[PDB]
Amino acid sequence: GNNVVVLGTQWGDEGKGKIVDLLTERAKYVVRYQGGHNAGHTLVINGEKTVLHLIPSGILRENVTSIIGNGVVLSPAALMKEMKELEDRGIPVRERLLLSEACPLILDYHVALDNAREKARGAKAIGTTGRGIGPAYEDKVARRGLRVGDLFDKETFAEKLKEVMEYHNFQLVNYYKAEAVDYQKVLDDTMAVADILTSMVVDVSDLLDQARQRGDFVMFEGAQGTLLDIDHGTYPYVTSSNTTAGGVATGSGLGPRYVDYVLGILKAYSTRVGAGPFPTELFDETGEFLCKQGNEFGATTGRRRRTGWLDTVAVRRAVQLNSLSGFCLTKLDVLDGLKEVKLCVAYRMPDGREVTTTPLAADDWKGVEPIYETMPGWSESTFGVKDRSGLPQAALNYIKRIEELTGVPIDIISTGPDRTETMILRDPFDA
Amino acid sequence: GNNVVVLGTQWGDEGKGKIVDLLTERAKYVVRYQGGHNAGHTLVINGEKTVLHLIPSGILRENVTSIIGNGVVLSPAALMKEMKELEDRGIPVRERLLLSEACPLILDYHVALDNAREKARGAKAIGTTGRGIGPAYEDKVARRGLRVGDLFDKETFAEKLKEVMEYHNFQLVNYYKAEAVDYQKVLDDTMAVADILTSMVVDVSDLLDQARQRGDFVMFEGAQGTLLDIDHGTYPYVTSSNTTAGGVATGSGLGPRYVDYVLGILKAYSTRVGAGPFPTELFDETGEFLCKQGNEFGATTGRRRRTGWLDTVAVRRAVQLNSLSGFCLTKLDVLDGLKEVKLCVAYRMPDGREVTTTPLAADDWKGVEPIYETMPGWSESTFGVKDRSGLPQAALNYIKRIEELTGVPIDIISTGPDRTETMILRDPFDA
Numbered sequence A, B: 001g002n003n004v005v006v007l008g009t010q011w012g013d014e015g016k017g018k019i020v021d022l023l024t025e026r027a028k029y030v031v032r033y034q035g036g037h038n039a040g041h042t043l044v045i046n047g048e049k050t051v052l053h054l055i056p057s058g059i060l061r062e063n064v065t066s067i068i069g070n071g072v073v074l075s076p077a078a079l080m081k082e083m084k085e086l087e088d089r090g091i092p093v094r095e096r097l098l099l100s101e102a103c104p105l106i107l108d109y110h111v112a113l114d115n116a117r118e119k120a121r122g123a124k125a126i127g128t129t130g131r132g133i134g135p136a137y138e139d140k141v142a143r144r145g146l147r148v149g150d151l152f153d154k155e156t157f158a159e160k161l162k163e164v165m166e167y168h169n170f171q172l173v174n175y176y177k178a179e180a181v182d183y184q185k186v187l188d189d190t191m192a193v194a195d196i197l198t199s200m201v202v203d204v205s206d207l208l209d210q211a212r213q214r215g216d217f218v219m220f221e222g223a224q225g226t227l228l229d230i231d232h233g234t235y236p237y238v239t240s241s242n243t244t245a246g247g248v249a250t251g252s253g254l255g256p257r258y259v260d261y262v263l264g265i266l267k268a269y270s271t272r273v274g275a276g277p278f279p280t281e282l283f284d285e286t287g288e289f290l291c292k293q294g295n296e297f298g299a300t301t302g303r304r305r306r307t308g309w310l311d312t313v314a315v316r317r318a319v320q321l322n323s324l325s326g327f328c329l330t331k332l333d334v335l336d337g338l339k340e341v342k343l344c345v346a347y348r349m350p351d352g353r354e355v356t357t358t359p360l361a362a363d364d365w366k367g368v369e370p371i372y373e374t375m376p377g378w379s380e381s382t383f384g385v386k387d388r389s390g391l392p393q394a395a396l397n398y399i400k401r402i403e404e405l406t407g408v409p410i411d412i413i414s415t416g417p418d419r420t421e422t423m424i425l426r427d428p429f430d431a
Ligand SMILES: Nc1nc2c(ncn2[C@@H]2O[C@H](COP(=O)(O)OP(=O)(O)O)[C@@H](O)[C@H]2O)c(=O)[nH]1
Pocket: A008, A012, A013, A014, A015, A016, A017, A018, A039, A040, A041, A042, A043, A044, A294, A295, A298, A299, A330, A331, A332, A333, A334, A414, A415, A416, A417
C-alpha cells in the first residue's frame, strides 16, 4: 500500500523510530501526526545511535521529506535544540523538514502548567513526561492557543502571546502558588527562532492530497501507543492526543479513506512508563530481567520502564481500534534464554467472569487479573537474526501463537536495535 | 459500502439530520462521533418536524440502534430533556439509544466557563452556541474531566466531582469575577439521572468491530461542518472537535480502514452562524432572500444564519480532508426564481495572486476575495421534485458545474425538508 501507518500497539516504546527508519528507504514522506516531544524514538544505524523526539524518523534518509503535521503540538525550543544537534552531525534538517502552520505551539508556561497540575494531583499524578503536552492541547481545544500560523505577524503574536500568558500567569501564581513565567523571555526566545521555523511551513493536507494522487509512498509515524490514547486509553493515565490510527487523518489532513496499510508495532513483552493499569506487570527476577535485557529506560525522561508479559487481550483492542493490517514483532532477541514465556490470553474480572475484551477507563481495570498460556522459552540466540530459519522453533511457535490469538499476521520481526537486524516477511508498501 | 459517513462539507447546517434519517432505512446503527448538543438537526417526516441535538438522527426508525460514541461530549441534562420530549411523542428513546462509557460529561460549570470565556473575548468572541462544549473538551484533553464511566461508582464520582468544581469555581469567582456554580445542585441533578444514563452504556468500539464483521450497515452522522474543524477549520472561529472524516474513528473506535463511503452534505448556497471568515458572504437583497427563502435560522440558538454563494474553493478543501465519495446537494429548491446564481471558483489573495486553495487560520483569510462564475438561475419550481427530469436545465447545469469543479459526483439531490422530497441517484450503501 502507498500510504503506510506505523504506530504503537501497546503503551509506547514498542520500537517505532527504528521501524520507521527501516521502512522509509522507499518513502517520499514521513509524517508525524500527534504527540510532541514526549516521544523518544531510538534509531541505530551501523551502531550509531539517534534519539528523535519531535523530528520525524525519516530525517536521516536524504531522499525522504520529513513532515510535522497539524496534530503535533510543536515546541519551538525543542525543535531548535534537536535541529542543532542533528546539524552538527551532518544532517541538514532545514532542508529535509517541513511543518504545518496549524500546529499549536508549546511554550514555557505550558511546562509550568504541566508541572503545576502534576504537583496538584499528588499521589495520583499521571507521570507525564514533564514536557508541556497536556496544556498545549487544552489551549488548542480551548481556542486560546497559539499556532505556527500566529508567528506570520510578529506584532499580533506579542499581542496574542501577552493575553494568554497573562491568563495562565494568574492561575499559576494565584492558584498553584507557583512562580510566574516571564512574558518577555518567552517572546524573545521565540522571536529568535521564528524565521527558521517559519521557513519550513507548507500546506501539509494539500501536499498529501497531491502526494496521494501521484501515488507517492507515504509513511505515517505514530507516537506513544494505543492504550495511551486520550479517548480509548486507560483514562486519565493517558497522553492527550489520539494515538490510535484515526489520529492520522485528523492529525495530517489526509482523507481517512487513503490509509492503505496499518503496521502495528508489537514489542514481544510489555512496558509502561507513567502510572496506570498494567495487568501483566512483573515485579520479580523475570521482570527485572526484562528491563535489564531490553535496556528498558525511557528514551525521553530516562525513567525506568515497567515490564510485563505480552498482553494479547490488550493487544486485541489495538487490532480493532487501528484496523491493523499486520504486526511487526520487536525485541524477540530479548526473550532469549528464558526457560519459558507467557501470553495473557484473557482477563479474570473481579466479579468472577472470564473476559477477553479490556476495560476502558483506568478505574475499571482496578482489580482485573490475567489468565496466561505458558510456553517454552529458548536458549539459542535470536539476536541479529535476519531469517526465520535462524529462529528456533520455540520462537516460531511463540510467533505463530500471537498470530493465532490476534488474527493478524506478523509481517516483520526485529532481532536487534540496528536497522538491519530485521526480517521483512511482507513489506507494507508492496501490500 | 457498509460503513457510510454523512458529514457537513461547509460550516454546519447543510442538512445532515434530514439525510441521516433518510438513508438509515437500511441501517442497523447510526453513530454520532463528535460535538455535543451544539448541533441542531431538523428532520421532517410527513410534515412533522423534529430537531435533534445530542440524540442521533436514526432515533425515529424503530429498526435502527442509535449510538452516542466516545467522541461526543455528553450533557446528562440535555440527554434527559430530549429523551422526555421524544418519549412523550411515542419514541421509546431508552430502547433505541446506546452510549459510550468514554464520553466526557458536560455539566453546568462547563456552561459558566463557556459563557465566562465568551465574555472575556469581548468583540472577538467566537459566537459559541452557549452550551458548554469547549470547556468539556478542554477538561477531556486535560485528563481532569469526568466521563460516563465515572458514574459507575457514585461515591468516587462526588469525590471527583468536588475537586473539579472546586478547581473551576476558583477561576470563575476569582478570575472572571463570575458567580460560582453550586457543587450540590450539580451532584443532585446528575444523580437523579445516572441510573437511566448508565443503563444505555455499551462498549461502542467492540460493538462496531462486531457489526463490521457481520457486514451490518452502519451510518456515521457528523455534526458541525468541515470549516469548523478544531484543526483544519478557520481557527479559532471553529468548534472544539474534529468535524472532518478522521474524527469518525477517533470518535467511535472503528479502525479508520473501515470507512467505505463518505457522503458530503453540500447546501447549494453557503451559511455560517458564529463569527469567522466567510468569503462568499452576501449582505444584500440576495443574501436576505437566501436567509428568508431557506428559513436560515439556527436550529439550536435561533440565531440568524449568514448566507452567501456556494464556495467551491472552500468545498474543495472538504473533498480532500474527508476523502469524499460523493455529494448530496441540499436546498436546490431554495435557489428557485433567482435570475442568476454564482459559484466561487478561486480566491484573489491580498498580494495579488489568484489561488484555488483556502487559507488555514482565520487571520490568514482576512483580506481574501472570491472570483465567481456567474450562471443562469431558473424560474421553474424544483421544490419537492423527486426526479432530475423535473429539474430545469439551468438547475442541471449548475449541478453538473459543481461536479466539474470538485471532481466528486453529486449522488443525491434534496428538494425540500421532508424526508421524501429527495432524489437518490446513487445510494451510498450499495456502493
Ligand atoms: N534488543 C532489541 N532492541 C530493540 C529492538 N528494536 C528496537 N530496539 C530498541 O528498543 C528500544 C525501543 O525504544 P524507543 O526507542 O523509545 O521506542 P519507540 O518510541 O517506539 O521508537 C530502543 O532502545 C531501541 O533501540 C529489537 O528488535 N531488539
